[PDB]
Every structure is written in structure tokens, then in C-alpha cells.
UniProtKB/Swiss-Prot annotation, chain B:
N6-acetyllysine found at: 89
The organism of origin for this protein: Homo sapiens (Human)
Residue windows of the WD repeats: 20-59, 62-103, 105-145, 146-185, 188-228, 231-271, 274-308
PANTHER family xref list: WD REPEAT-CONTAINING PROTEIN 5 (PTHR22847:SF560), WD40 REPEAT PROTEIN (PTHR22847)
Covalent cross-link Glycyl lysine isopeptide (Lys-Gly) (interchain with G-Cter in SUMO2) as placed by the record, residue numbers: 4, 23
Name of the protein this chain belongs to: WD repeat-containing protein 5
Mutagenesis / variant outcome for changing residue 264 to A: Reduced interaction with RBBP5 and reduced ability to stimulate KMT2A methyltransferase activity in association with RBBP5 and ASH2L
Keywords associated with the record: Acetylation, Chromatin regulator, Host-virus interaction, Isopeptide bond, Nucleus, Repeat, Transcription, Transcription regulation, Ubl conjugation, WD repeat
Pfam families: Beta-prop_WDR5 (PF25175)
Superkingdom field: Eukaryota
Any Gene Ontology biological process: negative regulation of transcription by RNA polymerase II
Stated consequence of mutating residue 215 to K: Loss of interaction with RBBP5 and reduced ability to stimulate KMT2A methyltransferase activity in association with RBBP5 and ASH2L
Protein location: Nucleus
Amino acid sequence: XXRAX
Amino acid sequence: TQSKPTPVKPNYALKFTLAGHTKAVSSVKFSPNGEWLASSSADKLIKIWGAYDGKFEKTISGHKLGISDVAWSSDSNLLVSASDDKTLKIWDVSSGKCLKTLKGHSNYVFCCNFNPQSNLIVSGSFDESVRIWDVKTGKCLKTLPAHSDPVSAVHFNRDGSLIVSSSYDGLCRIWDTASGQCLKTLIDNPPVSFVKFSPNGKYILAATLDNTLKLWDYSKGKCLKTYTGHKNEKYCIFANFSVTGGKWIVSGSEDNLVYIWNLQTKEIVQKLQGHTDVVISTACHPTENIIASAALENDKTIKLWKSDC
């Protein structure tokens, strides 16, 4: 991944 | 001790580039004992590297979807990970095995941390809650209806009596760990993409998606310092206090650079060049002047930088 997109 | 060394600028220089992840790296963290660096990735994997030589050590697997965050226990023996598969996992680093799967969140788990005592884990999720977990049993102890949008960060203070959380709702909240009740809300409200307590326990460093970092005295609701010049309007980028040499603020940036500020003067003292994608995560070694950085999909590597001050 959520943090990654 | 006749003289107080007062560096004006650090000289971080690239020493190692760590490849191995097959998708975007999401987070890097140095073990408290200074021995290891742990990395999480959209590739569903956690990897462990030598903190000083960047030597690959092991891959840890088990999550069914990508991992957004990873964190160490105080004794450097355990890791916890937060995954899109809606669970956190507790890992024994030595064996590489999953010890517990923490189930309860109803959407992506975004962020995680042990408390100093390491008997508890705190998590934040797209489900808009903050959860507190018993490490020993793997059970959820408390569920806080913490925010009205995904929770981007959660961090315990130095005795674990307080939790700070940040959210896309624009708020930063401080929670009493024992009761789960809110102690304070700090509030125009752009998404707050990261928060953490300072090494002294007195302040919170908070990032917002308007290219801004702010140092807050939370027990007063007063902003003491502000740091800008970098690019951050999209991703939840980690920020750090560097305290092993000079007092710096360190952060990744959406222009592929690592930014370093003088904590007091707020001036930029160095920008680290090398990554080929957004620097999503940075971390500072607990005892040595070493910075780890990690980047997204067009890069997928971790870089180790060392300085003299």
C-alpha cells in the first residue's frame, strides 16, 4: 505495497 | 572535553548498494543492537542485511501480499511486519520463522512498531483504526477508532505510555496506551503522512503531503521548527532524527534524493544523490553515522551512506 502505491 | 565539536555539514557518501528485492522497497530499519538492517517490499518479502557491509543475510517470507512496513523488538530478536493481506506477522529473526499472525484489521495494514518493553505491538491500517496487540499471545488487546481515513503512522514514546498516530484525515493524535483514550489532537488539514517521537521523547516529527516537515512540542501544541525544500505530495515517506554525530533531520524525497537538514537552523546541509526513483524510506544507525535509504519501482535498491560527523 500500500505504501508503495 | 575542552571543546565541543560543532559540525556545520555532514559528508555522507555512498558505500554500498543492496539489490535483491523484485518490486518496490517500502521500508528499512536498523536493529537496535546495530548489527542488522531489515527491509520490507511490495514483493511480499522481508530481507535482512549486514548493517555495516550491506551483506545479504536472509530472506523471510510468508505474507500473501506486499508489505508496507517492518519494525524491530528492543532486543533485536523479533520483527513485526504490516501487510496488504490485512495481517501483521511476528518473526523470529534468527530462524526466519513466523511466530504469530495478528488478525483483526479489515483492510491493508500500513504501519507498525513494538513498544520499548516489546510486550506490545501497535498497528495502523487503511481501515482507519489503530490496534494494540499482545506480543506473547498474538491477541488484539485494544482497537481504537483513531481516525476517519487510512492511518499512515504509529509510534510509541520511550516508556510506551503514549502512542502517536497520523492520518490522511489531516490529524495527529496522541493516545494513552493503558486506557486507549485520546490525550490530544493536533490540527488547513493536508494529509499527515508520517509521525514519530523524537529521541528525547519531548517532540513529534510530523510530515504532511504539502512538501513539509514540522517539529512539534506536543504537550503545548506549538510548532518549533519547519523543514522544506524537498518534494513530498504523494507518498508516505519516513523521516528521522540523526543524533549520532551532528543533530540532523533526514528524509527521503519524491525527487529521488535524500535530504538532510540542520535540526536547529532548518537549513539543508546535504542532499544524497544516487537513487533512480522516489526515496520512500530512510533510517539512521543507532550508534554509527550511517544512513540507509530505499526506493520505489524504478530502483528497488537500498543504499548505505556513511559520514565522518
